[PDB]
Design a protein around this ligand. Sequence first.
Ligand SMILES: C[As](C)(=O)[O-]
Lengths: 306, 306
Amino acid sequence: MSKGEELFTGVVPILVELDGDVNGHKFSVSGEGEGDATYGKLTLKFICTTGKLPVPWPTLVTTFVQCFARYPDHMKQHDFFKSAMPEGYVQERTIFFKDDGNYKTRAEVKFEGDTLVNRIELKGIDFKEDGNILGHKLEYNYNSHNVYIMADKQKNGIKVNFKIRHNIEDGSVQLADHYQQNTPIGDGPVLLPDNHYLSTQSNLSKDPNEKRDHMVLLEFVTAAGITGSSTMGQVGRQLAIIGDDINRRYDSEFQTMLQHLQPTAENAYEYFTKIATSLFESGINWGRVVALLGFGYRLALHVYQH
Amino acid sequence: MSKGEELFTGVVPILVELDGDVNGHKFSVSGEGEGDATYGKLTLKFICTTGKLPVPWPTLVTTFVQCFARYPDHMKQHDFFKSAMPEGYVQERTIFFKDDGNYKTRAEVKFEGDTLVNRIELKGIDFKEDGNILGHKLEYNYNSHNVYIMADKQKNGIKVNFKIRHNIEDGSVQLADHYQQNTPIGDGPVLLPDNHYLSTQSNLSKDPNEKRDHMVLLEFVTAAGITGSSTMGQVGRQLAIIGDDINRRYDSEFQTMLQHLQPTAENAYEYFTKIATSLFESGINWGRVVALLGFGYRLALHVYQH
Ligand SMILES: C[As](C)(=O)[O-]
């Protein structure tokens, strides 16, 4: 584990600032909320302080603080985001919108007193005015995605990528390919993770009281893709219980089958093939494949002996 | 072996009587010939003693003495038919002609002096008037079939079934599904067999000197299915019955194991290795190796497809 992990034991208040320029359109956004890393829960409201948002709100969702992800106990040595605190880290992204323009972003995430703050710059270029983005054709919703993470040892951080699918109004999808890197601000030791991912569920809503153009954003974030030793041990013990049952119930049967069949080494493969064929001609399912496997095994045991 | 087995060491003379009713048409048939169980050979001539046979001769072939089957030496303890002699046995059949009527038959087969006699009653119902049986559309020939035999421990006899394929003159086929049971008449000890079959070749011809409506029937009958390659069909059927149990009993558990384990393609082999290690730490036997293979198989399916 790390020391920064300790800053996230409770609910942490969050502030966000963003300056944006997409195809020459400028805009600013301010955000507030709270993060609860213990339960991988994130609550945010954003207001555009410069008028109407010039791009659809959903395209800013990935841009609008992965240090709040819930890491299971067996994966806590892979939480780079919290290990880099409180000094913080820099988050850089390039987002390619298929058949359209791209965003580039730079963001500083660090503590300021008790508050986690995220200052962001965004420059978008090459967007078609008829396109999904500037044409405002995206639906006000969000799908779940996996955020895949790798260590970037030469840069003392992590490399990240994922592919967002934005629902479009006619029923189609607009892809946004995210390439991301996160670099520590402090000179202290951070944690480099094994490959894993963040599983992310997001929800977009409105504040009925809010006069400005805005977005209410709720996110659930959980680390996964690494399975602990306890689960592997557990599956192993299940298989053993199952294997002992299979053995007690069927071993002598498979043995007498081979006794009657009297295979030699020269006819084993042939016998096996023909047997597999009349078994499977009434159908194939998982258990039948397993019976054929146990038969194959006993067949090999049988020819190997003698 | 048995004592009744010794009644068949040489050539045995055969008499057959049949009284029949199909859809109200009555008729009688008398038959004579010889059986030589030593070489699995059977030679019979039948005369309709009431005029023209109201049904095609091929449909009566199976009804017209399996104690003449050649049982190979390594299988003679599986010969229920001969173990029941001379006291004899009762053979009952229901024969379903697909898309047509059925035959019901009862037959007593026993020695009387030096002669093996077979007395039979046959009743057919629900036969279509223009159909293949009453329309006399079967060809005068016969295919080879296997007669599948299993013990019937509560009835102290055997259960038997098979499916005959009758060639029809227009080029189609008429299936005749046989269900059969054999019950000892005497109180002597009979042989109850393991599962096996009789391979039956038949030929139908005429006597050029016979003016009455008649059939000459030659049959070759040999038992197999106990040892060697002839066991392959049964082993497949066993595996299918077993595979289906394994599937009913464990398919869902293996699925919930893989879902919880969340293997990726990149960690699949490692997870598998670790799983194998905690399984085998309590021991190895055949059933445990089978369970591991079953897990491995479903695992390769899960990752290879995603
Ligand atoms: C499962 As199949 C099409 O080989 O009977």
